[PDB]
Amino acid sequence: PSYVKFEVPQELADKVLEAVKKAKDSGKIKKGTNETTKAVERSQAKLVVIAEDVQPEEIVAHLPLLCEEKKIPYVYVPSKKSLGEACGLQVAAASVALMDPGEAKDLVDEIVKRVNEIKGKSS
Amino acid sequence: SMYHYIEQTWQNKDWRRSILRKRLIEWRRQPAITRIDRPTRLNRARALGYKAKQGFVMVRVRVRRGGLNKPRPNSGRRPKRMGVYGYGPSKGYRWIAEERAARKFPNLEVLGSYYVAEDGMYKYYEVIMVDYSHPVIRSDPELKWLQDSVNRKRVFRGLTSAGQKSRGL
RNA sequence: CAGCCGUUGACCCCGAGGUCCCCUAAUGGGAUAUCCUGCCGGGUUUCCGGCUCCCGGUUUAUAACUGGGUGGGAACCCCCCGAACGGAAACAUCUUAGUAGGGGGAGGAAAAGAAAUCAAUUGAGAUCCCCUGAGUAGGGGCGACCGAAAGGGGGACAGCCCAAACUAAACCUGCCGAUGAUAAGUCGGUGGGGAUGUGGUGUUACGACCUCUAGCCUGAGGUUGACCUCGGCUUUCCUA
RNA sequence: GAGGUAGAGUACCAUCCCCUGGUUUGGGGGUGGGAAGUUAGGGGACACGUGCCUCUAAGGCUAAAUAUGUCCCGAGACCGAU
RNA sequence: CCGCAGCCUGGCGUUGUCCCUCGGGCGUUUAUGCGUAGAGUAGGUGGGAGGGGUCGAACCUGUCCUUUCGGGGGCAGGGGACCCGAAAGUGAAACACCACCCAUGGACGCUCGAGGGACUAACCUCUCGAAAGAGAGGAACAACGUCAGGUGGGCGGUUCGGC
Known part of the structure; x- marks a missing residue:
């Protein structure tokens, strides 16, 4: 795809899936892209998720660029269907956001460290 | 409001166009409808x-560019009405798009249309197409109008937005 | 001619039914045959149901199977394509003319319908048709000719939904059973669709609408002058 | 009081063509370019500028007021069997 | 008398990437200037008698390039600090600082030509392939659309005076 710039390893992705599913009860998590983008526009986003299997690619293509100047980190996950299951949704999910990391805060921060250190190597 | 940002990338000009050119080629392989x-x-x-609720659908179609596909006359005529070059299909391609699109699914009805891409040899459009026989849409208060007959086959009489546009209201 | 039905209520007329061959848009398949001819499932003697292009479901991801757009109709209506004859005393621009006619598609009416409208001393207030405005404006070898609008006067005069900001699964829908008057709805199980956005409020200009802040302002209850929950009300649907 | 929303190849422009009075001024289409988008735009007879005035499209949908005789009642300065 | 097909050429769009020589430029990067009178390189207009000055100068001594070898311009060390005048000439003066123009060369991202070349990924031609998809040759051409010009009894309407 073209809307994704840097590759994310599965093991990194796997942790995110475990990270988000924990937030089912403690943290506050946005589901559905509309509930995300404005919150991202509200600069209230701690971390956001962008699916690698979107169709067409433009459906969420704006999200990385906006988060740039907003200086808010973002993560990728290949299986958007899992994320819908991951967010406790009976159907697929393409965009979810993390207002607060809830219980996996430390897990989140390591992920932020994980992605950012890759970003440094990603130039 | 993703819909606000979808064209923020693609408002008039973006490198998105290069990607679509790839999609443009593969669509030529795809059926004309x-x-x-x-x-x-x-x-x-x-x-x-359009509502993603069950009962709607999307259709793509392509058409060839150029002036009107009009034959040269052969009988005795005055020069006024017998020229050929410069003619054009008076009713717009945006209009024509739904027409052949309408015929494809007569058990449905057309509402609206738009193009998404265009090269020098073809025009590519996207058209909303609705089932009225679905026992879902049958009970909508918000579209109860469609239960009547008169809403049928409209695009052929030009009661769609394109038709109104072709009529220049 | 001959015979019968009729006072056990005929024939007739009204309504409700029942039958209702073949081709035919004819659709199991085929047709220069108003005719022949298969495949399933049903009971079964006679026989009965289903079999182009689609929409949404069953089952494998191509196999069949569940459930619902075609043609005609006197004129009329809408929309695309689009003539010559003549006239100019000729004729080529023009006009005759978007009519004759072609194609598509409806209904009992259609179309259109809520201004990016006008006009002009700061006014009116959807559309349509009728009478005027008016052969006025304006167009054209300035030739035949074509030809408005605004306003006024009449008729009926009805005006509501969507997208966004903003709520965010609070959503719609198949079947079965119960209930419900069989309706709608609700209930229990079910199947489908849906964050790639259902449902909730709302769509208008010297602004409108939404959110937040602050202040004032309802019958019961509670909460901390203030807030909230349950009242009437608006819209919609359902027909016994 | 503060903040936010308010429809794109759409408007618009050049060109060719079509038609309507629309004429250096209208609407439609083809072709090529091509915006702003609320602190937006358009319109107010050539163009441009300035002020003043009024509307908000590029999606819907809509009661009635009129078009007609395949038909059915009624009437008639309509004809009497070429 | 003309009109329309078709044809030829060219422009625009479907039109991509590397270039390549030269001529153009676009927004930039920079650096180079003696008709005579005169301390002397006044190229021509501006604000400007102050500008440089451990917020580093005058002096002479060489390495170096150039030029009407006239002469100016760029090098650090030797030198730790000095010169132009509001004063003398020039139809037009300050190598007092900073600007504009002409004029010489190279380069940067972009554009157009005289053009030329190359590639394939568009697209075209063909084949295989049930489909999906694959392979082979040309090629940003061709072909199409559109526009213009040249040709155009191939087709269409017409007139072919009057006495």
Whole structure:
């Protein structure tokens, strides 16, 4: 795809899936892209998720660029269907956001460290 | 409001066009008429009331560019009405798009249309297409109008937005 | 001619039914045959149901199977394509003319319908048709000719939904059973669709609408002058 | 009081063509370019500028007021069997 | 008398990437200037008698390039600090600082030509392939659309005076 710039390893992705599913009860998590983008526009986003299997690619293509100047980190996950299951949704999910990391805060921060250190190597 | 940002990338000019050129080629391989389960640029489709609820569908179609496909006359005529070059199909291609699109699924009805891409040899459009016989839409208060007959086959009489546009209201 | 039905209520007329061959848009398949001819499932003697292009479901991801757009109709209506004859005393621009006619598609009416409208001393207030405005404006070898609008006067005069900001699964829908007057709805199980956006409020200009802040302002209850929950009300649907 | 929303190849422009009075001024289409988008735009007879005035499209949908005789009642300065 | 097909050429769009020589430029990067009178390189207009000055100068001594070898311009060390005048000439003066123009060369991202070349990914031709998809040759051409010009009894309407 073209809307994704840097590759994310599965093991990194796997942790995110475990990270988000924990937030089912403690943290506050946005589901559905509309509930995300404005919150991202509200600069209230701690971390956001962008699916690698979107169709067409433009459906969420704006999200990385906006988060740039907003200086808010973002993560990728290949299986958007899992994320819908991951967010406790009976159907697929393409965009979810993390207002607060809830219980996996430390897990989140390591992920932020994980992605950012890759970003440094990603130039 | 994703729909606000979808064209923020693609408002008039973006390197998105290079990507679509790749999509442009593969579509020429695709049939001249086909069904896409999810409409492309929702900023238009939802702007035409399309609801992802069961009972709607998306269709793509292409047409050839150029002036009108008009034959030369042969009888005795005055020069006024017998020239050929410069003619054009008076009713717009945006209009014509739904027409052949309408014929494809007569058990449905057309509402609105738009193009998404265009090269020098073809024009590519996307059209909302609605089932009225579905026992879902049958009970909608918000579209109860469609239960009547008169809403049928409208595009052929030009009661769609394109028809109104072709009529220059 | 001959015979019968009729006072056990005929024939007739009204309504409700029942039958209702073949081709035919004819659609199991085929047709220069108003005719022949298969495949399933049903009971079964006679026989009965289903079999182009689609929409949404069953089952494998191509196999069949569940459930619902075609043609005609006197004129009329809408929309695309689009003539010559003549006239100019000729004729080529023009006009005759978007009529004759072609194609598509409806209904009992259609179309259109809520201004990016006008006009002009700061006014009116959807559309349509009728009478005027008016052969006025304006167009054209300035030739035949074509030809408005605004306003006024009449008729009926009805005006509501969507996208966005903003709520965010609070959503719609198949079947079965119960209930419900069989309706709608609700209930229990079910199947489908849906964050790639259902449902909730709302769509208008010297602004409108939404959110937040602050202040004032309802019958019961509670909460901390203030807030909230349950009242009437608006819209919609359902027909016994 | 503060903040936010308010429809794109759409408007618009050049060109060719079509038609309507629309004429250096209208609407439609083809072709090529091509915006702003609320602190937006358009319109107010050539163009441009300035002020003043009024509307908000590029999606819907809509009661009635009129078009007609395949037909059915009624009437008639309509004809009497070429 | 003309009109319309078709044809030829060219422009625009479907039109991509590397270039390549030269001529153009676009927004930039920079650096180079003696008709005579005179301390002397006044190229021509501006604000400007102050500008440089451990917020580093005058002096002479060489390495170096150039030029009407006239002469100016760029090098650090030797030198730790000095010169132009509001004063003398020039139809037009300050190598007092900073600007504009002409004029010489190279380069940067972009554009156009005289053009030329190359590639393939568009696209075209063909084949295989049930489909999906694959392979082979040309090629940003061709072909199409559109526009213009040249040709155009191939087709269409017409007139072919009057006495």
